[PDB]
Design a protein around this ligand. Sequence first.
Ligand SMILES: COC(=O)N1CCN([C@H]2CC[C@H](Nc3ncnc4ccc(C#N)cc34)CC2)CC1
Length: 275
Amino acid sequence: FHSFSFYELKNVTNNFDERPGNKMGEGGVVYKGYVNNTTVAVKKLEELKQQFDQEIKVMAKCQHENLVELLGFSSDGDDLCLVYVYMPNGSLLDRLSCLDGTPPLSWHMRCKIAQGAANGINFLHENHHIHRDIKSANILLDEAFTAKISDFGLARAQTVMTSRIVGTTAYMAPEALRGEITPKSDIYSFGVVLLEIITGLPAVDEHREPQLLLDIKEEIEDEEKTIEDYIDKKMNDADSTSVEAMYSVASQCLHEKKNKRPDIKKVQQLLQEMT
Ligand SMILES: COC(=O)N1CCN([C@H]2CC[C@H](Nc3ncnc4ccc(C#N)cc34)CC2)CC1
């Protein structure tokens, strides 16, 4: 990776222009820039340095079509910047909420994104990495709306435990909330992402009943609700067979027992059969 000068980065971003005009960031703060006349994303950041070091270490060995591409970094400055190829269509989270007036994603786009995200996670697991923060805010979208997994700062290379429990509560598997580190926890988080794709609903909403999205799985299983009551209404091209095939994958990912969950290869294979 290229070791960019802080002065070069500090100014490809107009002295880190906090007005939306270079800012956007919510990772770390992300700024848009231009280096070797490539549009770039400059993410400006103690334990923060450890997450910076881990980001470069994971990015060094993990290069895939469904993972963000790190181009460089800056450390000899004031301080800690990570340079990536810019993702013009932002996050899956933002696009699901139609932030800033963007059109809703079609079912066809959503199927290609679920498939892409799964291929990205499969690569990580084959390369013996546990992401630990799988969520729609960490699924980025390029110029063709190709899903790219991001944020490897908390990544690790069952039976493993930690005294510093990390991740996003609304996406976390029960064992992850207790400190276990397992690739099975990434499967659970991906199940929540599949529910976000089907429903267009965020994983957590304080002003909603139920507050947590994963709670709909029980409403459907108790015959209290159907997946059809929850399908995002901002689509015209969804069909029952593929929505049901995707919900069945999400439901399997969301098994409370980590051992009963499918592996990423099974998930990837099921989403492929869905199309
Ligand atoms: C009020 O709230 C907003 O306006 N919001 C919500 C947060 N959003 C995100 C900001 C960061 C952005 N992140 C990025 N954007 C482009 N390219 C990238 C390449 C790599 C990486 C990484 N690792 C990150 C990137 C994704 C969207 C922007 C709108």
